[PDB]
């Protein structure tokens, strides 16, 4: 599928993000089943909120949940499902499931794709509304099964550290 | 594609439904061409009505038209195209084309995915509006070529019977 | 992917068009990377305008940019991403990038799919609004990299000539 996409053209500040779910999609949590390579519904989330940004992952990375590193990509409008955006990390939302670490990175489009985010260097350069919504969305991002907690934010450096760790984890 | 998805985790009341077309999609009738594995437009339907629910099929089933068993899945909001919903049958709309039987099952999300439909056991537990719309939509679900009739509804048991028959038909 | 789809059932007036981007999609320019077979974002376009029609290509054709022949397909409503529409050419918008020729064909659904466009034989049979929008959209259809110009329109015959040339180019 996306295996032949590098994690980026110049890591960790220049990455490729495969988009699973476009911005403003309904509050539905999915997962890619590695065994069948199909997208499954996990949860119809108990929130009126919709996806605050486009949602997917960096190809050829490995996070602590066995899945590729998660990324939200802020764009002017929702992109096509399944498309790939060359991107630049600007921050990270820290999450722990009861199974471990579970970071959600924030990225903007690469300067080659648009001039609009060129001076967005940190996540705090984005509207406070968007950051609020992002936090509140993932506070409800979990399955029904009894047995997720949203901590704080990390900066651009912390996001780049997450990527480097995630890339090293995959090649290992 | 979806061949490695079982027809369900516990048949026939616990099924997997691959979604071709999300709820509220334009009135366009498609078919999967088995020979090329691509989705083709068959008809721009002569109705203002839009898809009343998500529309797809159960993998590894065989209906009397050579295609997998058709299913509509009622959800809070439209799902992503191509995603898979673990589901529970609640009824069936009976249709005959001039080529034979052509049932359209009604299913809700599995209890693992949402609490909202837990007490929806029969299709008649759903709003009468939705059932009207479903009937009126498929009354227009046909190609232009000269040479479809919508009868009535069957209950949850009848839907489960359709699934068991469809699963038996595939393994044969 | 779409390699097993013929360029049409009866060339050049009866073609098959694989749709990448539905009508009314956000102003985002994509390309299919032949090496990875994935859809990439090229540009978030500097226009408020959205896709004026469905956008894709004819399988098994070869244009002067190494990509299959581009086509816009006018429909009542946006189609599903990735679906295939049997279509009929009615005109062409001429474009030159700084790299050569770059025609954008205009097609309507085949008579088998809908009665609505049966008497639309030329692109000038379509609303002048739509033609204006089409022209203005592609005036902004380009990457940011320094180094596209929209000329005029050709008729149905000229579009069919583009197809025949494109089909001959592929078999060569
Ligand atoms: Cl720009
Ligand atoms: Cl719930
Ligand atoms: Cl019609
Ligand atoms: Mg993920
Ligand atoms: Mg079907
Ligand atoms: Mg193209
Ligand atoms: Na994850
Ligand atoms: Na069928
Ligand atoms: Na082109």
């Amino acid at each position: 599928s996306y295996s032949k996409i590098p994690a980026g053209k110049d890591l960790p500040n220049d990455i490729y993000v495969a988009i699973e779910i476009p911005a403003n999609h309904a509050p539905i949590k999915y997962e890619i089943d590695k065994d069948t390579d199909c997208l499954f519904v996990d949860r119809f989330m108990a929130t009126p909120m919709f996806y605050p940004a486009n949602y997917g992952f960096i190809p050829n990375t490995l996070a602590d949940d066995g899945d590729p590193l998660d990324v939200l990509v802020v764009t002017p409008y929702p992109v096509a499902p399944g498309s790939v955006i060359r991107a630049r990390p600007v921050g990270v939302l820290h999450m722990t499931d009861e199974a471990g670490g579970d970071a959600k990175l924030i990225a903007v489009p690469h300067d080659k794709l648009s001039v609009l985010y060129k001076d967005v260097k940190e996540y705090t350069d984005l509207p406070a509304l968007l950051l609020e919504q992002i936090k509140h969305f993932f506070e409800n991002y979990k399955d029904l099964e009894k047995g997720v907690k949203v901590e704080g934010w990390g900066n651009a450096d912390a996001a780049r550290a997450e990527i480097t760790k995630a890339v090293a984890a995959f090649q290992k």
Side-chain angles (χ1 to χ4, degrees), chain A residues 1-3 5-8 10-33 35-97 99-117 119-144 147-148 152-170:
Chain A
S1 72
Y2 300 101
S3 58
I5 312 304
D10 180 26
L11 301 155
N13 209 41
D14 188 338
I15 63 171
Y16 286 128
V17 183
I19 293 307
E20 291 163 329
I21 306 299
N24 299 139
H25 188 83
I28 304 167
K29 175 183 177 293
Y30 303 80
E31 71 174 297
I32 290 182
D33 181 68
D35 254 340
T36 65
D37 195 28
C38 294
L39 193 66
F40 282 72
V41 181
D42 286 342
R43 173 82 189 270
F44 295 94
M45 299 162 55
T47 179
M49 172 90 208
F50 282 44
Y51 274 79
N54 308 285
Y55 187 82
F57 58 86
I58 310 175
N60 300 325
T61 58
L62 197 65
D64 295 330
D65 43 25
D67 296 332
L69 178 63
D70 302 326
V71 184
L72 292 143
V73 185
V74 184
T75 64
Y77 309 99
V79 302
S83 66
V84 174
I85 317 179
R86 184 185 187 178
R88 176 169 55 77
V90 297
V92 48
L93 181 76
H94 297 301
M95 290 177 68
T96 73
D97 46 13
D102 181 33
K104 312 287 179 187
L105 267 66
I106 322 305
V108 300
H110 193 287
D111 290 353
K112 290 297 210 70
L113 270 51
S114 169
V115 305
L116 290 183
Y117 303 85
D119 292 314
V120 179
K121 308 292 184 59
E122 300 287 344
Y123 70 103
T124 38
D125 294 318
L126 298 167
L129 179 65
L130 172 59
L131 292 180
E132 290 170 2
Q133 291 173 337
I134 283 172
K135 191 175 81 108
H136 287 163
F137 191 83
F138 285 95
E139 288 178 323
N140 295 277
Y141 194 80
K142 51 182 153 36
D143 309 330
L144 281 176
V148 156
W153 305 84
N155 46 13
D157 288 320
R160 283 185 284 265
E162 283 284 349
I163 292 160
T164 306
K165 178 187 179 180
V167 169
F170 188 81

